[PDB]
Structure formats: C-alpha cells, structure tokens
Amino acid sequence: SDDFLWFEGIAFPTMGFRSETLRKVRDEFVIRDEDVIILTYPKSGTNWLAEILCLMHSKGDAKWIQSVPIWERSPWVESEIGYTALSETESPRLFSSHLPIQLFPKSFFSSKAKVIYLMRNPRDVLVSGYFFWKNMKFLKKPKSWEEYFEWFCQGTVLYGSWFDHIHGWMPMREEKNFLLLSYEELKQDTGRTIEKICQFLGKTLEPEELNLILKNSSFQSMKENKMSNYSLLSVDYVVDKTQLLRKGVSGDWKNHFTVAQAEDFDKLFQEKMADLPRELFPWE
C-alpha cells in the first residue's frame, strides 16, 4: 500500500480502484459484439479520440461533448465508477481501457466487438506523464526528472512498461475487428484519419454532417474544451489546480531531454523493439 495498488505485477492509482473489481474484469465481465472500445497506454491521446467518436454518433451536433464529462460519456471499465455504470448500460456501448492484454476481459476474445488502438512517440508520453502524475495527491511522487526517467524505462510506473504494453497488443493487428492508429497521423491529417475510422466502423455520413464533425474536431478546439482536458478535477484530488492548464509540458520532448538522455534512449528503443518492423513507428 506504499502509494499505489499493486495487482498481478502492475501498479494502479490509489483512489478509485479495488483489487476485486480488477479480478472480475478478467473473469466475469461480458463483452458484446456491438460494443466499441478505445485502447491506449496512458497520455497517448485518449481524450481527443473519444471526442471524435461522440461527434460521429451525434452527426456533428456538439452540446454533448460540451455538456457531459469524458469519464461519463466514455468510461474506464477497470475503475469502480466505470464498471458499475457499464454493467447496466444499453447497447450500443462506447468505453475505454488502459489495461495491457493479459488483464483484459476473457470474454472479448470470443467476440466480434470492434477495438481502436492508438499509440504515440514514447518520449512525449514520458514528459506528459511526468508533469501530470507529480501533480496528483495520494500518488507516489518522484524526487526528480532523472529519477522518473529511470522508472519509466524499467517499467515501475502506473500501468507498467510502455515496451511490454505495445508488444502484447501488436499481434492482433491484422484481425478484422481491430484498427491501429498513431497520434502523429491524427494530428498531421485529422480529416484523412476521420475517414479511416468511418470506414472501419461501417457507418455512413451525409456531406453537411461530415462538415460539422470536421469543424468541431480540430486540435485547437480539443485543447480548450473543459469537458475533455481534465480541468474539471476537484481541488480534493489535485495538488495545485492552477498548473493543470500549464503549457509546454504535454509533449515537446526536445525541450526536456538532455542530448545524452536522447542518445541513450535511441539505443534502448532499437534494442527492445528489434523483433518488430521498424516502419510501423512513424517518428525518428
């Protein structure tokens, strides 16, 4: 209980999670063929993808993403609140999960449910998590940038190692009910990425309906919505509410790694990811 819940070799947050729900998640939760699920390692762009999916279902009309909080419109199945709400929700259901493949519901692998897996450059994921997690109460905090940098590459951080999460899920990449996307293609060509998603899910949008979704799904529009940027967390769970909105700390890895840290991280990545095709990863 040393500042985190330990379960099957993986660390989880202290507030909002319990050992028994995590066990029922694997052994008993029932997945349906009509469910749609967003899968990500934390801080890889979950909130932006969730906003786009709500907008496609509502044909571009936006008071929903402007009225309801992301954890209500796309709940995390492994948390208490999420598990409760989902277990009593009428199809179709839209939800999210950060779990690695060994802890995901057994029921899924016997289904036809559609999943979308989103990955991001791990240098930006490391920076974004450093600033976000060190600002949350009741969570084990690092004593310095250098110390967090070492935790991340050894794997002793929330939800485990980024290298193990990616290796576990990649073998599902050519299955019919699985779509692989990168944060980089989403930001460089949002419109082309929205079309890949509409084809995979198999729905049809009218011309004026696609125009509205395109208007409400821009990067800029995304960062300023209070329903999606986490700035609705109460003063009871945050250390300093004022820097929740700080800038230059949710990516921009070059402004934070020293030259020696970047050369050493390049060698580590090549070593660990050598058994997969290099061109699957669109970043230097």
Ligand SMILES: C[C@]12CC[C@H](O)CC1=CC[C@@H]1[C@@H]2CC[C@]2(C)C(=O)CC[C@@H]12
């Ligand atoms: C919502 C969020 C933050 C965003 C993540 O994608 C999902 C998540 C899991 C546990 C939450 C955390 C916010 C901060 C919380 C509330 C803590 O301080 C402990 C539990 C933490």
